[PDB]
Amino acid sequence: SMKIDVVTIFPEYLQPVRQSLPGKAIDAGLVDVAVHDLRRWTHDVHKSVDDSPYGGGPGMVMKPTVWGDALDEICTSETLLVVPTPAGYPFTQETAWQWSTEDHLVIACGRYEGIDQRVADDAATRMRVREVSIGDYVLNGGEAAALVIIEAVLRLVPGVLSLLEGPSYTRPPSWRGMDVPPVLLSGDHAKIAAWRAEQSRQRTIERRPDLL
Amino acid sequence: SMKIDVVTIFPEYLQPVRQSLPIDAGLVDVAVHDLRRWTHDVHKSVDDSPYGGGPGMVMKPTVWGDALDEICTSETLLVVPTPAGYPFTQETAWQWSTEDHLVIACGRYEGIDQRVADDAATRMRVREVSIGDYVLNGGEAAALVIIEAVLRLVPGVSLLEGPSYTRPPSWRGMDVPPVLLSGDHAKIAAWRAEQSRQRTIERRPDLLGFDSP
Ligand SMILES: COC(=O)COc1cccc(COC(=O)c2cn[nH]c2)c1
Ligand SMILES: COC(=O)COc1cccc(COC(=O)c2cn[nH]c2)c1
User: Cα distance from A37 to chain B (closest Cα, Å)?
Assistant: First the structure.
């Protein structure tokens, strides 16, 4: 049973996952995903969420006063506050497993140059805060990363949704001049396992030598 | 100018392309295609059990082949998100940012029949890529990540970044580091350099050539 709150200036972006949820898991009270528009907590008529960085430079920084108010309302001491950022600790499958047993995740989607650092610093004095990167590239905002995180975590929550894996094949046995490797149709399951292991080894060497 | 086609059995999940990415400026067109449009069955069965055994289902090559025949040309870069792919990094995003035509094929279940990629590679460039070391249910979220990463680099649109600050200079008894308020560019550049190095060592030692925790 997990509650996920997402805070973003683009709430419509998160509507796919809101619809990716089986009705059964919602009605069983296994999962709830709520999305909140950050501008609800702006306090000027122009609904400002960012401002120029101290120390100069191009880019805008999201205002601590706005985020502070939002997190104050949404978070509790039990919350795991997740902040996607290219400067974060690596988000991996191990991370997803760990977070899959959390009761309350709040994902704070930043944009532009990022969120004023005091927001996370302040939050960290009364809840668990995790700045995480989903990969070594740069996006415009945290929303796509939030989708990845939500999907990776929730698919590990029962009933809600190393080497590289080798190739897989299904019907038909012959297609556009290409046959399924005959070993897979051999009925020798020890030999099939060894073939797949070697395929995995070769693919890992070729594509991800870092994993060795 | 760039064209992006995404092919998926869940085209509704790709609606978030029309939010912060834009298209509206006409520098790029993005189209989403329902893979089931290329089935001939009354049940539209896109998957079956894997040869050689194993859990789950594999997407049949027949439906993908027909779809890609219609959508791709020899100039197409066929992108296939997969946890078993080459790593997609910022370098990749730069490389793809000058392409005319990306087609992103989103898999589901336990994957796509290997022959789809093998067949496509006889006529176009194919890139199987991972966006990170975690497992998703399907390629669609990875497609969105790839699209975002690439589009912000399209003409007409290391270390970890350290902390950023903005007004007010004091908040909840927390002050902006005084050097940032000082207007001294050399001292500010140096402080920021030191913060980034400190953050990179702590969070991503691998980037500086050290063992990971
Ligand atoms: C204190 O927290 C923050 O400042 C975070 O704010 C930002 C700043 C820049 C970019 C993003 C979006 O996340 C990614 O691009 C990302 C995640 N993983 N890999 C790339 C978010
Ligand atoms: C030949 O290509 C395929 O078989 C594609 O198959 C699948 C199957 C399930 C899920 C996905 C989506 O990719 C990721 O989860 C992913 C990407 N990066 N890191 C994780 C793709």
Answer: 14
Whether B76 and B151 map to the same domain: the answer is: yes
- The resolution, in angstroms to one decimal, equals 1.8
Domain span including residue B44: 1-157
User: Which method, experimentally, gave rise to this model?
Assistant: X-ray
Helices (H), chain A: 15-19, 23-27, 64-74, 93-99, 117-123, 143-154, 189-207
- C-alpha span between A22 and A18 (Å, rounded): 9
A197 and A100 together in one domain: no
Question: In B35-167, at which residue ranges do the beta strands (DSSP E only) sit?
Answer: 47-48, 58-59, 77-87, 101-105, 125-130
Verify that B115 and B210 share a domain, yes or no.
no
Q: Which residues of chain A lie closer than 8 angstroms to B199, CB-CB?
A: 87
CATH number at residue A184: 1.10.1270.20
| Structure tokens belonging to residue A8 | 């973003």
Please, what is the angle between helix B61-71 and helix B114-121, to 10°?
30
A152 with B168: Cβ contact below 8 A: no
**A122 and A200: one domain?**
no
Nearest CA in chain B to A178: B115
Distance CA B29, CA B26 (A): 7
